[model samples]
Target: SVIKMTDLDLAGKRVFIRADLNVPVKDGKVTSDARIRASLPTIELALKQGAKVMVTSHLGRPTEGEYNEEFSLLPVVNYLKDKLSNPVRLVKDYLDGVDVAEGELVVLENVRFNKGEKKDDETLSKKYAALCDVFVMDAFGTAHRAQASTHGIGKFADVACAGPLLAAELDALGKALKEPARPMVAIVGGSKVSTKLTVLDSLSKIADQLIVGGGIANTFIAAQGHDVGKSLYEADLVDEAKRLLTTCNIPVPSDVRVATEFSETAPATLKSVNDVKADEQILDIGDASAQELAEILKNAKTILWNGPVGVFEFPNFRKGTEIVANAIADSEAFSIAGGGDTLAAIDLFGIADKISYISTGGGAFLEFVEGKVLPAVAMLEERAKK
Candidate 1:
């Protein structure tokens, strides 16, 4: 029952690993290699195990049946080579006779170049599937989507399993879903309440304490017949938030720190939830809300956080997130971070190493939290017994 990367004997095996290569690109240069770096642990582990690792990923969105240089993952390949202790083999002209060796690791061109790659194209899927004896769904970012290589190729793979990163992600989420420790807290924060409605709903159902923050908090306060000033409230989701809170088991902030601008440079600061001057915005959670959430998380056995409590991108407003981040890190509970902003905010605090796990996935991971079956994961399970 304890399946890990070390559990698999990958020697002389052809492994296909899908990852999220969507890094910040600027004029054929990689701005941030975080995504690519996140993938190295899985690929390097496979290679060290003497398995031939073939990596496939989608960069920026591209047109079907066309090669776009701007969206190419070649830079990622180069970056991977530079980071990994082992040399990486590059396979150009992905059109004919894709060469691979059992002891070598190679990075494939963007999978989006082929139109069939998305339609669950059997021919193309079979082509890549044939080259690999084992298939590993390492692309946690795209695992939620039903694409050809990500899901379709596993139909023909000899051995299908999730790599280290995916395993960690699923395992951490499992703790939150199936066997979470008592006093588990779900902290939901973001700029808009319209987003993450399902996640909030699901969290409320399972979480002992649901801490609503950011513009989402303002949404609930507004629905409760309170003055949140000109807070960045999701006016449309007011009724939805009201309905969600009415179900109980979830606590909305009683007071908020209202602000006028979203940036640190703006002449605005935290104010009481009820005492907000006109023409101001609500940027961060107030001390009262933070203390309340901190107290709830004090007894938590697991802490699941997503999004920022406020506009954490700004230093002034980052205090709300920082306070909560430190609390989670210092607490005895097992803490995990997800979502793009959530993970980035953790990095911004320089405490990623302390947390239990940081999911490399954003969209796909969110879908998992929403209790949806991932097609890519499904394919692997189908092939596992075969």
Candidate 2:
């Protein structure tokens, strides 16, 4: 059990929050405000409870510890000021022993401005921990990282708990992995089998049926002595992929869409795995495979989907991914999907609202799904117990 956002009595305290406001920017302008909006509920709650709020977040990776305006939180600061009712302050530099007014919010500069942030530097963590009386971690996107902001602050704060967004994500993912309904199905896809090896092994234990696709499925085909042509796959992991198939009996596509050239304009044709020509590259699964996967999904009580079945960036090659997205949308299963690419695909297919849960985590999602203890969650749990 963990302490929720509602559990805090935040009156007259300086509350520090770790948020995922790493939104996309183009030419010094924010391209998206989705992450900022996602964090508003926790910030709003703190303000409503008469607590002074301080926000910390990291943008893109800064090469050096030196402050670069390109990665600054200026855009986020300006955006929050417009969205929030309270007076939002931007703490640009040298914020030691700063005073925050009650019912006001202070947005700190990018936390990555310090060299010690990513390293979880003890001195820096203590400095940040001293800024507030309460700590709330709302950044599920970075939960996997045990950095100063998300992990270290919990140690010195008067109280540390999960924010609403983090609590919701954990609830959905935790229930699915910890005690999912029967006949669980997992859809695993990506460019390489090596990347999903542990995920495959982990899902195999709980998922009743695992549907493999993308270059991952191609590697499995090669492991079965079928020709995959020039498709992207791991040569070294073929044996491991073969072993997983032998033991788990997970389903891989029997036929795939093959193309002679890698281009949007390239003509593609369906071919059986055994009949793939040496000159062609496997790009997507065939109609038969998508139909087969869809049929299985209709009866599934719980489902986990990650990655796309094909190169969806190219308009011509997005058919297989679209097919799967639509199928999952129409299914009665408790569906969950994650990964940056998967989210984009769901949006492209215009079915984001149809999915039961959409996780913002990528590596963190896989780590949590694999049953690993996240450093942030562990700290929150420890604090909850106290």
Candidate 3:
């Protein structure tokens, strides 16, 4: 187990926190403050502990060794200035050293602008380590990356620990992945089977019932000797699907919603998996299959949801995902949902509060679900071992 920030003596110590303040920025303004809001507790806690806090995060994908106005963190700094009553100042050049007052919060400029940040240069990493007595890794969204701020700094810092947000995320995700409640169900949905093959394979071993949806389900339907028509599926992975089906309890959709053309205005026609025509594309699951999946979710003791079951962006192809979302929401299972598209569907359906834990990490979330060790978390674990 890794050390948590709460367990450390932070009073009067120089604390460097790498947070995920990568929020959407519009013309000189922050359009979304959710990421910043999520990070407020970590920053505020450090202040309450009388620690000299210095926080930084990488914003957009800015080219290294140069400053780009468009990718600047000024908008985020401005957002923080308003949210925080403490004196929040943005320091553009602080690699050599930074003067952070115990009561004031210092926001370091975008780390991506620094040379060798993405490459995790030892010199850059050591420079970041020099600025802090304690390094707190709070950016679970970028925990998968082995960048200098996320991973490298931990090795060189005097003390490294997980911030409250990262600790909470690890605890929740670990509980589901490591020692989940019985009757665990995992819903893995997406357009291609190749993209989520490892996640599906991992879930097959852990989940009592593996429910597949969208084009992935179509591939499974084809594996069961049914025609998926023009649906988005991998013909090459049919055997892989068949292999998983025999080894696991995968619930393939018996009925699907088909459309002649993939569009907003295309009419949805419900048909049995065997009745699909060559001209039609399977866009969503039929009501019967959705209800069946809902029943499974209702009985589940733990549910891990990722990706939407259908083209939820389109109104006609949204009902299937809506039903599944509602079921997860209504169920007493400890439900956890991640991924960008899945978050959009949860927001669209207005069921965010009903879910047990909503993860901030997208790629990082999937990597954890795939049983991969996050580089940042690994660094903390290594530090704890010593």
Candidate 4:
């Protein structure tokens, strides 16, 4: 039912797809191929529709109104071609070769190359939109931001529609936040509790079971006046954390995996929340917390995750995030996840195919699910109805 629209209906229509192919490129080589591959579905769909697909994205922050090699999309275009297992024939320009063929595929240079892209200029937005017939938005991570390609360009499109991937991301998140099977459990992870304040606030309102992990848990544990030695504690955010704890019935870590010196050399062991030694950093939720989270997730009709439970980059701290990640994937609930590292962890643990939906937007996804309207999505919606 979700795949209701097809190329048969969109054939010959110009499709402007807002994709997040902001992949890191190094010396004519791509560093992370994740973003490019994520774009395949939308690009393939447009190609199938016999549509001349115009794809655009932002890369690293570059100087305004200036061209920088470090921020160029040439490497992305290169990887884009590699993704389809074929070379993307370049005709010396972004808008040309693709404009003439019924099956041409094109990748626009870094939209950030133009100051108008970041500024969200109306005239520039409309001009960018002019390159296509139908505006197809598939960049959920950018949904909440009002950038030209994501927000302003919609005004110029004759019709606007969300690509299948975008539709699915929103639909799945909507289902998780609005109506769920029951006992909705959320695994909140990642460092920087300060950054996730708004989501924590929103989650406090709706989540029946909120499991805090990663560095955030250490902060909360320290807030309890326990001996959290050298653990990650945002002293400035304690009041905010205290305020958060007052509003939500959530689980603080009962036990956690801790390390001294925070290096590969440090030995990791489980300790009660109150027993964390000062001078040591908490890396992951311990066995007990992991089992508890897994137990809670097992019966969850709906599970939403946004952060990793551990420092997954390090082998020693990978157990918590990896275990819970795989557990949720193996669970019976309808699982949905967001954020880049969280999604990467899912794939790192080989569970990308197991989850119901993994979002493309990190900040935008968080902001949207928290009941905030993204200016870009709003603009696109307005244009779609007009």
Per lDDT, the best of the predicted structures is: 3
Single out the weakest 10-residue window by summed lDDT for candidate 2.
90-99
Taking the tens digit of each residue's C-alpha lDDT, what string does model 4 give over 268-326? 88888778666778888888888888888888888999888888887888888877897
TM-score of 1: 0.91
**Poorly placed runs, candidate 2 (over 4 Å):** none
Kindly report which residue stretches of model 1 are placed more than 4 angstroms away from their true locations once superposed. Answer: 1-6, 26-29, 83-87
Residue-level lDDT of model 1, residues 237-266, one tens digit each, is: 999888988886666666556556666686
Taking all chains together, each candidate's TM-score versus the true structure is: 0.91, 0.96, 0.99, 0.87
Give the lowest summed-lDDT range of ten residues in model 3: 174-183
lDDT of 3 by residue, 150-190 (tens): 99999999999999999999988987888799889999999
Ranking by TM-score: 3, 2, 1, 4
Rank by lDDT, descending?
Answer: 3, 2, 1, 4
Candidate 2 vs candidate 3: the TM-score winner is: 3
Judge candidate 2 at residue 82 and give its lDDT: 83
